Symmetry: D2
């Protein structure tokens, strides 16, 4: 009952790899129709093949300002206006502070901070008409903890926390909750610089309370929790899925 | 992911409000539940509503002399619990300049010491199973000081770090520890709030949604934290407060 | 002595009004040479007259990318490279979520988040050569609490918190601390829509623990604290100067 | 003049070693009369000799409930009622979760959480009459981060954060601010860390700066929180930790 997503439409950005891909899998398994958004078709088609006819694929650069109107139309085309929006697209350039370039900084802010806001803003009117909506932003361990090479990334992930609260303040009266999941270290696109260094992966695993890094299945429950009726009275929260990394 | 069949849950403070609803939700997910309270008749009402998956234990969980039998009695109907929900609490409402030794000590004993020593008693059987769930109850007064709440706030800020410490100690053994932080619900700890209509209206307007909680709001979060779905969530405070803290 | 700034140079952005202006006054009174930065000359000239020969004025748009190199040269010209950097320039467009424009959003991000980073980055090398530096960013109550009309502003002020932590992680090994001061409600450039409405000012005053809004003098001690030897082992922190607004 | 404490009286608990001792030196150097509180007279006498005639020493167990009235009288005797209260007394028993004893837990709560509240409560009326007061509590890295062996300690240090906020909500309308300094230091309370060279080295590398604290690091912060400079800072935790918490 509470975690059933039948009759719901979800859009997932960054859906061609890692956490966005698994999020699309989990929401589809819960009965949702899913629209995966990514830059490159071929991985989106792989994902859609794994899911079947409940999955549609949209190729788009969600950071592109010119593209926004068409991106929104294409997302809405297969299954109608989405009820659920999971913003798993992100980038970490890994430029340390004294090496940051204008372009690395600007691309990080455009994808991690500006894109989730303008995409959500485009989709809110239909959610408000329905009186029901779920926005899941992606926070980070660098929402609160500065790691080497993460200054732009950290800026945007600290931004995502207050942005999530702001979206709640603006839109939760209309039945749209806005929360942010903060994964720890998972084998994803945005890692593997970490998961190629066996020793660093071991340190990171030892920093958690549990003593291990995440596996993709770890995100199934949290994603479902935040995207369903179960979380109706949870809004404007950061939920860390990190094995206790932040508790130590 | 959310199936609790084959699991045993103990809920303290189970005779009213949020603890009662937690027992209902966990039983509905297939768990055997043991409700703990001081008062038998409300516990039996709860057990009647649930049926044979529910047992009732009468105990003062703050009593140090009582700890061993409280633990034995909880373990008796269904075996050692896998899930522990510490929903027992007190707010004496003594403002700072009116705080008494007894009110302070009763707040610390029930809200802070009791969840620790009860969890400690139950951790060995969870570790032998390699699986366990601890849910503490945090509060809006974990971070926000309200009139008359100084002792209560002390213990609820304490509960946050205590939950982290429980995670650090026990999560390597498959025992997660998290704290759920309700906003304003009609419960035992409230009705000083909810029988004052204007105050309830102000509190509702302080949330992002614009309403106070209903008991059903807590079903999903509780089950989320008590099930396989939250295996990699530990040492966290999850506010269930309609955005009260977001504003 | 702990609070003596003799021989130090401070640059303060947003120096022509409100908190930036008062910060310049406080640092000059502690013995520092100060360079006030603002858009229009006449107010900076007033401030310099009040301070006297320890004050210099630089007219610049610190958000301008083209302007950054000469902005930095002009700041460095009167007294040499600054040791202390106080980023009090900011904007709040007050556009609510469903009214946000590209231009309002981009201008908020450019001034509130990108400007402090690239300005600090330009000045860090001389601080590192001296082995001593103070960076003070301006956080906000909207670093953690969403207010009506503040979604862009809040995004950047949540960003400023993690950015301050990231600056600490990058530069504090070289003797440069980075902290963020978080004013509550003061009568300033950014709050007069707020201080302009007597009832709203009274509500905000009642939300503090003390029971009053800030006066400019309230910022003197904290600013000095964060800019002096007294704070040598404080870095990557947010210090709220808000009468307990956040405690309730 | 913002940081001048001439004409003010400060009481520092735990004043015979480490951070309380350094706090007493700092406040005295800023012109305050200081009363050092400790259990053993002789270290207090050393401190008083170093300070000179601005220092008085009081022997007391600030966790003692019976002793409270007399402790307060003795603190007030040499220089009058204090304007500044610095609660540097604390204990960390270092008992891990499965080893906690009733006595270790009770002594941690009694000293670290209950003592600061009841001592502050005893002294606030005279501060309120003056319309001016400073309360400095000691938070900790374990206010937010669980370290091995710190479960009781962490409970009390998370508690101190909300207790500080509650003290602000109760007493800041009368001119009494209440803040907590959270040191990341060679002290009484950390020598198990500083007698292990490798542990000190990781701890130093975990900070942003790359070093552990020296006692002098606390001079500016203590003064900041104890003076006119911080009139509009209340209910805050100020970490003095080299960026330990930023990473």
């Amino acid at each position: 009952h509470l975690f059933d997503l039948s009759g719901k439409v979800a859009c997932i950005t960054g859906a061609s790899s890692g956490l966005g891909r698994r999020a699309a899998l989990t929401l589809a398994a819960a009965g949702a129709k899913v629209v995966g958004v990514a830059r490159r078709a071929d991985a989106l088609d792989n994902l859609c093949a794994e899911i079947g006819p409940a999955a549609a694929a949209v190729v788009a650069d969600v950071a592109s300002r010119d593209g926004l109107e068409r991106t929104v139309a294409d997302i809405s085309a297969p299954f109608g206006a989405p009820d659920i929006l999971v913003h798993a697209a992100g980038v970490n350039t890994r430029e340390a502070a004294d090496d940051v370039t204008f372009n690395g900084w600007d691309q990080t802010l455009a994808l991690n901070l500006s894109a989730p806001f303008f995409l959500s803003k485009a989709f809110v009117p239909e959610m408000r008409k329905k009186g029901w909506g779920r926005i899941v932003n992606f926070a980070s361990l660098q929402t609160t903890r500065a790691f080497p090479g993460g200054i732009a990334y950290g800026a945007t992930k600290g931004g995502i926390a207050q942005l999530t609260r702001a979206m709640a303040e603006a839109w939760s009266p209309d039945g749209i909750t806005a929360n942010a999941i903060g994964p720890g270290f998972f084998p994803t696109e945005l890692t593997a610089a970490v998961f190629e260094d066996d020793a660093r992966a071991a340190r990171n695993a030892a920093q958690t309370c549990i003593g291990r890094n995440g596996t993709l299945s770890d995100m199934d429950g949290p994603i479902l929790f935040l995207c369903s009726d179960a979380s109706a009275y949870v809004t404007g929260q950061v939920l860390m899925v990190d094995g206790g990394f932040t508790a130590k």
